[PDB]
Amino acid sequence: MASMERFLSVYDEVQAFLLDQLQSKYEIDPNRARYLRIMMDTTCLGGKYFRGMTVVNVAEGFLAVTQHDEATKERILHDACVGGWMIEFLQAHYLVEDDIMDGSVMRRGKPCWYRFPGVTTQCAINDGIILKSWTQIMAWHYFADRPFLKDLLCLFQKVDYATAVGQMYDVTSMCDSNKLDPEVAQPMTTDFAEFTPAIYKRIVKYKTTFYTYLLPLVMGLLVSEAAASVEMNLVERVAHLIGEYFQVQDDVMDCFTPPEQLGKVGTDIEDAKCSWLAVTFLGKANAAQVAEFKANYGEKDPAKVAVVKRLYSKANLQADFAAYEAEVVREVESLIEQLKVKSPTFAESVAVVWEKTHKR
Amino acid sequence: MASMERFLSVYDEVQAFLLDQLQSKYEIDPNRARYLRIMMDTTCLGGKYFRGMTVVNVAEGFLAVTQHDEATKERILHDACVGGWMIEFLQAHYLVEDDIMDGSVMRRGKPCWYRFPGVTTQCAINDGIILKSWTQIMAWHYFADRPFLKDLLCLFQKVDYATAVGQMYDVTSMCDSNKLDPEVAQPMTTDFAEFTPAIYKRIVKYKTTFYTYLLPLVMGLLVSEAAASVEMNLVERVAHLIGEYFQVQDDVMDCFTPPEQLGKVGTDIEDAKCSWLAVTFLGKANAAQVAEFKANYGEKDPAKVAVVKRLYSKANLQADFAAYEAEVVREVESLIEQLKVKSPTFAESVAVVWEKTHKR
Ligand SMILES: CC[C@H]1CC[C@H](N2CCOCC2)CC1
Ligand SMILES: CC[C@H]1CC[C@H](N2CCOCC2)CC1
Ligand SMILES: [Zn+2]
Ligand SMILES: [Zn+2]
Ligand SMILES: [Zn+2]
Ligand SMILES: [Zn+2]
Numbered sequence: 128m129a130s131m132e133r134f135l136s137v138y139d140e141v142q143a144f145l146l147d148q149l150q151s152k153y154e155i156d157p158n159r160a161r162y163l164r165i166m167m168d169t170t171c172l173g174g175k176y177f178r179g180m181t182v183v184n185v186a187e188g189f190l191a192v193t194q195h196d197e198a199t200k201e202r203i204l205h206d207a208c209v210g211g212w213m214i215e216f217l218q219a220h221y222l223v224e225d226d227i228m229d230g231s232v233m234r235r236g237k238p239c240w241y242r243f244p245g246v247t248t249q250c251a252i253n254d255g256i257i258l259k260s261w262t263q264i265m266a267w268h269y270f271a272d273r274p275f276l277k278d279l280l281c282l283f284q285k286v287d288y289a290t291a292v293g294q295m296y297d298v299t300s301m302c303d304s305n306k307l308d309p310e311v312a313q314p315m316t317t318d319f320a321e322f323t324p325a326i327y328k329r330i331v332k333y334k335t336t337f338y339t340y341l342l343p344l345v346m347g348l349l350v351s352e353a354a355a356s357v358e359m360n361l362v363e364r365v366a367h368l369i370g371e372y373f374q375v376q377d378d379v380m381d382c383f384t385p386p387e388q389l390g391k392v393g394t395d396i397e398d399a400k401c402s403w404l405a406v407t408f409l410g411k412a413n414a415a416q417v418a419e420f421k422a423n424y425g426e427k428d429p430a431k432v433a434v435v436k437r438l439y440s441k442a443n444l445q446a447d448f449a450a451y452e453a454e455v456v457r458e459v460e461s462l463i464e465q466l467k468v469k470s471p472t473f474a475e476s477v478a479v480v481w482e483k484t485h486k487r
Numbered sequence: 488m489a490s491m492e493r494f495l496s497v498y499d500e501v502q503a504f505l506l507d508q509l510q511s512k513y514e515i516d517p518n519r520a521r522y523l524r525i526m527m528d529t530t531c532l533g534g535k536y537f538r539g540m541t542v543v544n545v546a547e548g549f550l551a552v553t554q555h556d557e558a559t560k561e562r563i564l565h566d567a568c569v570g571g572w573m574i575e576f577l578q579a580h581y582l583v584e585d586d587i588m589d590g591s592v593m594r595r596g597k598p599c600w601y602r603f604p605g606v607t608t609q610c611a612i613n614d615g616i617i618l619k620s621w622t623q624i625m626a627w628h629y630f631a632d633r634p635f636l637k638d639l640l641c642l643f644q645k646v647d648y649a650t651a652v653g654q655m656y657d658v659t660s661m662c663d664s665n666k667l668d669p670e671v672a673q674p675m676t677t678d679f680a681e682f683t684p685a686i687y688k689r690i691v692k693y694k695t696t697f698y699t700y701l702l703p704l705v706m707g708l709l710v711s712e713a714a715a716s717v718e719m720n721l722v723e724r725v726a727h728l729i730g731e732y733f734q735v736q737d738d739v740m741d742c743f744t745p746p747e748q749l750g751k752v753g754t755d756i757e758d759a760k761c762s763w764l765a766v767t768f769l770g771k772a773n774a775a776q777v778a779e780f781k782a783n784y785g786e787k788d789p790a791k792v793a794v795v796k797r798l799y800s801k802a803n804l805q806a807d808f809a810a811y812e813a814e815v816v817r818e819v820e821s822l823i824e825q826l827k828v829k830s831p832t833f834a835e836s837v838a839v840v841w842e843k844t845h846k847r
Contacts, residue, residue, distance in 0.1 A: 149652070153649065153652050153693070154689050154692075154693075155652070156664055158664040158665055158666075158667045159655065159656075159659065159664065159667060161667070162659075162667045162668070163655075165669050166669065169669070224612055224613070224616065227608075227612060228608065228609045228610075228612050228613065229609065243669045243670065244669070244670060244672040245667065245668045245669045245670055245671045245672055247672075247673075248588065249588045249589065249658055250658055250659070252584055252587060252588050252612065253584070253588065253654045253655055253658065254655075256584065256651045256654075257648075257651045257652070257655070260644075260647055260648040260651050263644045263647075263648070264644070264648060267641055267644060277637075280640065281627055284620075284624070284627060287620055287623075288617075288620040288623070288624060289513065291613060291616045291617045291620050292509070292515070292617070294613045294616075295519065295523075295610070295613055295614075295617070296519075298609055298610055298613065299519065299522075299610070304516055304518040304519065305518055306518075307518045307519060307521070307522045307605065308522070308605045309525050309526065309529070309604070309605045309606050310603065310604060310605055311604055311605045312604040312605055312607075313605050313607075329514050332514075333513070333514075
């Protein structure tokens with residue numbers, strides 16, 4: 128059975144489980160069940176399933192090099208699908224709540240869940256809570272007797288928390304740290320002193336890399352009972368690196384990829400986000416250019432946003448991107464090596480992850 | 488050591504742990520640590536700590552009848568405090584997100600967290616996520632080697648999910664079930680056919696009783712290693728009953744307790760909530776009164792809200808409350824009995840829970 132077909136089948140099975148348990152154990156009625164099935168489909172399906180599929184792909188790699196009964200291979204693949212769906216639903220939880228937080232209009236060329244006429248923010252916040260609770264219901268049901276249950280739950284729990292901290296770093300990235308104060312409305316930075324490479328790195332590492340790269344790779348190891356084929360410090364370092372790279376790309380596309388191809392109107396400029404472009408720009412600009420950046424950044428006025436766009440386009444940022452890109456290709460290859468020692472299999476999965484990221 | 492002093496001390500210890508781990512392991516900076524410490528204090532302190540204190544009180548009851556070393560008594564009390572704080576922080580998570588969902592202004596005579604000038608909804612949604620993640624960080628840290636770890640986590644997980652489902656039942660309680668549809672904006676019910684005792688009961692059971700009553704009692708048993716001193720079906724039935732009773736009181740006070748004494752302007756009438764008053768009113772009203780209720784309910788106009796208030800006050804609802812109150816006193820006493828068999832200790836704790844609820 129092809130891996131995608133398997134992964135999508137398991138969604139139908141998990142959905143049916145969740146909804147069936149709502150009726151048999153939570154006293155739900157058919158119309159509320161239907162609303163939650165619609166919610167589930169709309170918030171969880173539609174992407175490429177990169178994150179869930181990585182869990183499957185890692186597990187399929189160990190299956191080729193490890194002796195097992197047929198029934199065990201099937202169980203391991205089924206566990207990888209369920210775990211992959213836990214990461215997809217975790218993502219979904221975050222997408223729903225982030226879109227509410229940020230006033231987003233569209234994602235994947237379709238309205239944000241909260242903007243659906245019969246949803247509203249009042250329901251969408253809680254819909255998002257339910258999405259994350261589902262991930263735990265899946266874990267406890269499907270993995271109740273698995274030796275990896277504790278490690279999976281503890282790992283999931285740490286990644287979730289990192290992601291939340293990451294969101295906090297992100298939403299506060301345009302404030303002066305020393306000005307943060309629940310009692311006082313937060314002004315945007317005037318100096319941009321906190322738009323550094325290290326600070327950017329901290330945002331991206333927590334907000335994205337933990338859930339997008341670390342968790343799918345390690346989940347694959349956990350369901351394969353194969354955490355000993357790796358040096359965990361290496362899996363960390365490689366995932367952080369691939370993760371950062373991926374966010375840099377999204378940061379560049381927010382600005383420069385047409386809204387139709389992007390699936391949303393990018394607003395990082397008007398939101399004053401600490402993006403790769405703003406940081407990298409500020410790292411090379413002269414005093415006149417820094418002045419002009421400061422006069423136009425984080426402002427809804429399209430002229431001022433077009434001013435920021437002009438500075439970036441004129442600053443030869445492609446040269447900086449290319450150089451960052453060469454250094455990451457370099458470091459990632461070195462990490463794949465250092466992993467190839469213990470597991471050609473895992474190094475190969477990490478190689479494929481890297482390729483899908485690099486080639487998008 | 489008095490139990491409250493102990494419980495509050497453990498908060499300072501857990502806070503210090505959480506914040507220290509953010510700095511040593513999540514790369515946090517002092518001003519973001521301060522923002523989260525403020526967040527934590529403002530969202531988690533200020534109530535009576537009924538829910539967390541019940542965990543402690545249950546455990547103190549078993550300590551009086553069970554042989555243990557001093558060091559073990561201290562460990563059990565410390566575990567009960569931590570677990571009690573997990574329920575308090577779970578509550579906090581829900582209060583923060585609910586207040587955002589509902590457009591609330593005040594709770595406990597102070598502004599809702601999201602309304603604080605340097606918070607905003609963009610941050611408060613995620614602050615709420617962090618609050619719930621904290622409960623898991625506490626559990627994994629403090630209970631890492633405890634035999635009850637799995638049962639605690641699985642229980643916590645089910646209660647959380649029930650609470651979320653409960654919120655869904657609550658926010659949709661004024662819609663016709665057959666009209667729920669993410670694609671279509673939801674009109675308020677015109678027939679009130681779903682304002683029944685059974686339906687009300689389903690809302691309250693999921694939204695409130697699981698986290699307020701079931702979880703503190705069972706957590707106390709779990710940390711005491713004492714789940715065998717009880718028939719779990721009885722602990723369930725008694726908690727549902729005490730839980731319903733408590734919500735009926737809050738439903739009555741939303742309407743009839745002055746805003747200064749209540750700590751918020753009650754809006755159940757204008758929100759068209761399926762409250763004990765609306766259900767009980769509709770269960771005894773004549774055709775003329777039902778007409779008048781339908782013409783005035785779920786409307787911001789203070790005259791129409793004062794019209795609903797007049798109907799209730801004229802409908803002799805105190806007679807219905809008194810009768811409900813006698814039947815619950817009756818059934819709760821019967822349940823305490825049925826529990827007294829296996830554990831005078833646990834029956835006594837449940838007796839105290841009941842008294843604190845009944846006497847408020
Ligand atoms: C294309 C890169 C995107 C992927 C989605 C990322 N965040 C969405 C909301 O919170 C979770 C993570 C932001 C970067
Ligand atoms: C005095 C009774 C109150 C206690 C708080 C209840 N809910 C608040 C928001 O979600 C969690 C539960 C509503 C009833
Ligand atoms: Zn965001
Ligand atoms: Zn982006
Ligand atoms: Zn509410
Ligand atoms: Zn209320």
